[PDB]
Amino acid sequence: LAHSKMVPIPAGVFTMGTDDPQIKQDGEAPARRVTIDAFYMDAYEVSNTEFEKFVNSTGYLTEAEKFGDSFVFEGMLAAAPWWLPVKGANWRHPEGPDSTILHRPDHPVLHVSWNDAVAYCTWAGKRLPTEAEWEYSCRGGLHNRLFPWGNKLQPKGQHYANIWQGEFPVTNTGEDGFQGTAPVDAFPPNGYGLYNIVGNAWEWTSDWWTVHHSVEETLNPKGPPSGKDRVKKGGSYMCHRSYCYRYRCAARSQNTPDSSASNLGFRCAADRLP
Numbered sequence: 048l049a050h051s052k053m054v055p056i057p058a059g060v061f062t063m064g065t066d067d068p069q070i071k072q073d074g075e076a077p078a079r080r081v082t083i084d085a086f087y088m089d090a091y092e093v094s095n096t097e098f099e100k101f102v103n104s105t106g107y108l109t110e111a112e113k114f115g116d117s118f119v120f121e122g123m124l125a126a127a128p129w130w131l132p133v134k135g136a137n138w139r140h141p142e143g144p145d146s147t148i149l150h151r152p153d154h155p156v157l158h159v160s161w162n163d164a165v166a167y168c169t170w171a172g173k174r175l176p177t178e179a180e181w182e183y184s185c186r187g188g189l190h191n192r193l194f195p196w197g198n199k200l201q202p203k204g205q206h207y208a209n210i211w212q213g214e215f216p217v218t219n220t221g222e223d224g225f226q227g228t229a230p231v232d233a234f235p236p237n238g239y240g241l242y243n244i245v246g247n248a249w250e251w252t253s254d255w256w257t258v259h260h261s262v263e264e265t266l267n268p269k270g271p272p273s274g275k276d277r278v279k280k281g282g283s284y285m286c287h288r289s290y291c292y293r294y295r296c297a298a299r300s301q302n303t304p305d306s307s308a309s310n311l312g313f314r315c316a317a318d319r320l321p
């Protein structure tokens with residue numbers, strides 16, 4: 048296993064957002080041309096094993112552990128009725144105090160806040176990616192496609208990401224092989240070498256959230272200078288076309304930086320190799 052390995056994301060210009068927004072309220076539009084300097088991106092979401100190395104080294108107590116609760120999806124035992132604040136849910140206990148990560152060491156770490164993610168990435172000699180870096184990386188060298196791999200959800204009849212199949216939120220058929228999370232190295236990589244950049248766990252980025260974007264061309268944009276929520280990208284194992292079509296690279300959502308949930312993790316980026 049090399050679950051902290053990074054890949055080189057090449058310098059380029061790309062179209063961020065879309066002029067065919069699917070969730071207009073989220074500021075998916077307008078499409079805008081963005082230039083990104085070469086940098087490195089983690090191939091994988093940060094796993095439980097990798098986060099444990101951080102905690103072993105630093106003693107870091109996550110925000111969920113200090114608050115004493117975190118959000119858990121009802122189906123696997125609030126923003127929606129299916130999100131419950133569960134006492135004692137945290138990265139080591141993803142569904143509550145009598146769940147464990149011992150059988151899922153290579154799954155993405157969950158119940159990590161934006162602050163927890165920044166602590167980890169900086170400890171590792173890295174940083175969070177910006178939303179633009181994240182989206183560029185997600186798109187994997189393709190232009191104006193829905194998904195990292197193109198426009199078909201199941202190219203060649205194959206599952207390419209861990210999302211929901213069935214009737215959400217009542218029945219997840221596990222058709223794609225995973226009801227909850229999958230190992231961080233599951234499913235094919237995209238054109239840049241990245242795994243589970245859509246689906247599996249949501250991923251924090253460094254940007255403050257806004258829905259107001261200009262069509263002006265930008266270089267290495269960092270998002271707005273202020274805000275209340277940070278941007279998360281990529282969707283999770285919970286997403287479905289019928290409710291929550293958020294497993295597209297252009298999709299975007301937010302949470303307060305001290306938030307945590309059982310479908311939200313992260314990966315790191317770096318200017319140079321650590």
Ligand SMILES: *[C@@H]1O[C@H](CO)[C@@H](O[C@@H]2O[C@H](CO)[C@@H](O)[C@H](O)[C@H]2NC(C)=O)[C@H](O)[C@H]1NC(C)=O
Nearest residue numbers: 094095096097098099100101102103104149152
């Ligand atoms: C985090 O630290 C724990 C505690 O030291 C590690 O677990 C121990 O590892 C030693 C050395 O391999 C084993 O002999 C013990 O059986 C383990 N003890 C316990 C309490 O589990 C753990 O391996 C470290 N985690 C990572 C990812 O490096």
Ligand SMILES: [Ca+2]
Nearest residue numbers: 209210223225
């Ligand atoms: Ca699934």
Ligand SMILES: [Ca+2]
Nearest residue numbers: 243244246248
């Ligand atoms: Ca993901």
